[PDB]
Amino acid sequence: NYQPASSYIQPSFAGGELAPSLQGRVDLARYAISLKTCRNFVVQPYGGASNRPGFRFNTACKYKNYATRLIPFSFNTEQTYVIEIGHQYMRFHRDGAPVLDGGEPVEVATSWHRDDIFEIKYVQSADVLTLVHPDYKPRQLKRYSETDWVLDFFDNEFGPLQDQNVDESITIISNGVVDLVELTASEAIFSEAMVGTTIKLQQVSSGEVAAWQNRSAVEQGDLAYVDERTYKATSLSGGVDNTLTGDNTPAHTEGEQWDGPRTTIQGVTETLGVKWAYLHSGFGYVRITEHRDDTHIVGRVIGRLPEEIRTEGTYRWSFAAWDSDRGYPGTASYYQQRLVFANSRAEPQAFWMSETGIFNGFKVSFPIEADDAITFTLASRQVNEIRHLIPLGSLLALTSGAEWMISDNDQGLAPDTVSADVQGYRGASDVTPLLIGSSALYVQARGTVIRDLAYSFELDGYTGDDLTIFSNHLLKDYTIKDWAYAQEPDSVVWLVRSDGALLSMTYQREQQVVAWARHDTVDGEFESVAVIAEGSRDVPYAIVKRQVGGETVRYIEYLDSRRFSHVEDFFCVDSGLTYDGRSSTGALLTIGGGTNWTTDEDLTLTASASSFSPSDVGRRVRVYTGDKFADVDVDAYVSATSVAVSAVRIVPEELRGVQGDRWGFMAKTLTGLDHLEGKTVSILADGNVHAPEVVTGGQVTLDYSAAVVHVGLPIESDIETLPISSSGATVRDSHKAIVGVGIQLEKSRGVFAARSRRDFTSSDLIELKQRDAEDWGEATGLETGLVELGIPTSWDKDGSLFIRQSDPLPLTILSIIPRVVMGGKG
């Protein structure tokens, strides 16, 4: 016989978590490159798997039992912030710390109700942020200082209006012509919801208005018109009985231009020339300010009403589209130097685009100039209320029934040339779409499904494919709550399941990588997630519900960095703080009074610039140099710079005389943990795991000195692979037995492994043994490369491994070599 053990290397984990229903598709590469359980282990494009770094505790926000949300905001590339929105308030954050102002956070009072904040849709343009909501007036947010912020309303000058009232019977009569004027209508049309708007009144015609015959005698006050423009004379050149009009037709839309050179014309013996002040060109908007009845409203006139409404009364009135009853914009975006607002409550399937350049106006002119305002209405089939505009290759509109594309055909954007086309019928939820490459990720309507969107030179139309096909179990009986895209360290999409569970993507379309990963935190739930710039690393910010002290608190969270050349710099605790003290700012130390001794030797320590005080006596100071370190106790104060220190171990020879690159004191009692009051927090001191101690009173005592301590909630991370099976003549039915495992860790320490039996318990885990040189006092170092570890074996039919790490250390699995021996069938 002598059939040796066999190895079945799995190069990648890019498949991510594989749904239980998918476990019978061995004929696909996903089965070969996926994992059945990947808790707290973010895949990596390259196909690795690294335990998620811990969430650093920033602070609690307010209103423990109220809703909250985060959005990303920027002040150009000068700085980035994180707005926090709750019940009728607003705060700011940066660098995982509150925006301090007088020892208190900066708050901007808001009107949004707590339940409605999640439906807020936002955009950004340089130093201006815009928030819209169907039930709230839009409020543009602008920043004037880090300690001074202002949230103003959106002033829609000549705001969008419905089509003119073709109902001829109803008419409106205005008492005055300029300034404070009282209106009157022949029907009950006005409402007390129009308290502040911008209505429009256009003259029926120029009845009771004199024409503009070429050469005529006029009076000091006239009201003549030429074409759609009513001018008023203000002066005459010669005598009142000797002045005529002239040939220069009035063409100005403002001013008082003449129409004759105040002189004779051959032999007409008149003096010619007449002033012509411009007046109402047919219409004038009235900004309503008061309500009296359904037939009586009062407002101020922006320009000037023609006298026809004063005397005859016009019928061509256009009520403003946006008010407090028909609704407000439900979504917004920018496009071709125009602001686009959409989804009013009364008129959902419509978007209004401002004129080119004037982001806060919606004027429309009679000649229909190209750069006037825009108004469209997507109808097609089914309800198609617009929810998301995104410029990808054109303005795209994602609606509840379809995914429209808006386009200018091929000439230009104008009220006449603007068109709209359908790209499919799948819908989209209210969740803000995400932007990745030349593709747009958008939640499919009704949640539970994630669809991407991009162009396709197969159908000449923006279309996409499902991303939840391989991990539907993670989302099917759940609904997505939020999103984010931390493209820089790893193209990961963080989203929240409405259960409080956080899931991650590893989306990279160019390399066909879609990896899912279920995450979790101890005694906690996730609420909202957003990412900002944060230097050179996209740092997500999350709202985490917790049950600290029998109360449902809400903390601010942000995912730490995976950058650490030494294990002591790692961070794998949820809502954990750091007590690092590796200060090297002009304070470089050197131990003197002898070299390379064995404690009890009266060794001298010196500092470059003070950095020592008599109160610091009895406190232990570490001195670093490269990787090596040493510990010495302060015994006496010789000077503010020079002191005597007693070693605790032999100072390593390569750490003598030469000036240590960095140093720092060590603490034993740690405070400021009231936010984790009464938790079984885990500790990590200088790359060494410390016994858990329950936070009592907000202080944690350590069993030894420690330069760097990371303290917080423990993290449970699990990997468990698919059962061994193959196509054709399968081996799934065959009995299997795994005896050893080659893992190929890289920059990792502390891997546990076992067999994935049904009765699996934490007590049978076998953990790796790595301590070869590892000098006294030095923590166990990082390990990179293949390591072969054996496990207790059984003869189950699952044939699945199980890798767990419950302690705060780095773990990174690049592959798996399960030492497998085949058995027999049933």
Binding site: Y2, Q3, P4, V739, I766, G790, T793, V821
Partner: protein
């Protein structure tokens, strides 16, 4: 060569390079080493009557044995096999001069039901020679140490690798080393030449 040394030798014989360095640490090798090297010792001691593992103790009388056997003796606690049963009268000091097996008494092994094994014999106040549960590894010779390690590797290979053919080849090896050690222990000792014929002795006394 201690417990740990023997198990490390055996583990490095199967093919695995890792040294267990203990008997109680948490790993498959440690529990395997413990749970097996106990039984491998217990059995390989019984395979042959090794000279270095020979004891001599007076048996403890219980009472009248079953039919035909005049006594029943409590089988020694730390015993693995009984070879010779005798009394001081059947074994006077210096009797090893004569190779004759006159000091071989009618003895049989049997059980009782209440407790452990029994030694049945007729001579009263009889001593015994037996292979004992050896505990000190410094008592062992190299060849037997290698036999121990080889047998242990054969016994623990299958959970460690899952290769039955590897168990077969280790069994063949362990048989070779066991035979070599048995032959050498035979050669490590000279009793005397065999006695003369029965008729000659019954004529001219030894």
């Amino acid at each position: 060569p201690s417990k740990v040394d023997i198990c490390n030798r055996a583990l490095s014989n199967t093919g695995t390079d890792i040294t267990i360095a203990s008997l109680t640490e948490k790993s498959k090798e440690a529990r395997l080493c413990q749970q097996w090297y106990d039984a491998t010792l217990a059995s390989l001691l019984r395979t042959y009557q090794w000279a270095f593992a020979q004891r001599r103790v007076t048996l403890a009388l219980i009472g009248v044995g079953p039919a035909g056997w005049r006594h029943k003796y409590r089988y020694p606690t730390d015993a693995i096999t009984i070879h010779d049963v005798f009394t001081a009268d059947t074994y006077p000091d210096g009797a090893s001069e004569f190779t004759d097996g006159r000091y071989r008494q009618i003895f049989q092994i049997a059980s009782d039901g209440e407790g452990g094994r029994l030694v049945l014999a007729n001579c009263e106040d009889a001593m015994c020679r037996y292979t004992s549960d050896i505990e000190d590894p410094n008592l062992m010779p190299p060849d037997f140490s290698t036999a121990l390690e080889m047998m242990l590797a054969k016994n623990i290979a299958m959970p460690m690798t899952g290769n039955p053919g590897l168990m077969t080849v280790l069994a063949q090896q362990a048989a070779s080393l066991v035979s070599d050690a048995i032959a050498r222990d035979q050669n490590e000792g000279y009793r005397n030449p065999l006695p003369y014929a029965s008729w000659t002795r019954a004529n001219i006394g030894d």
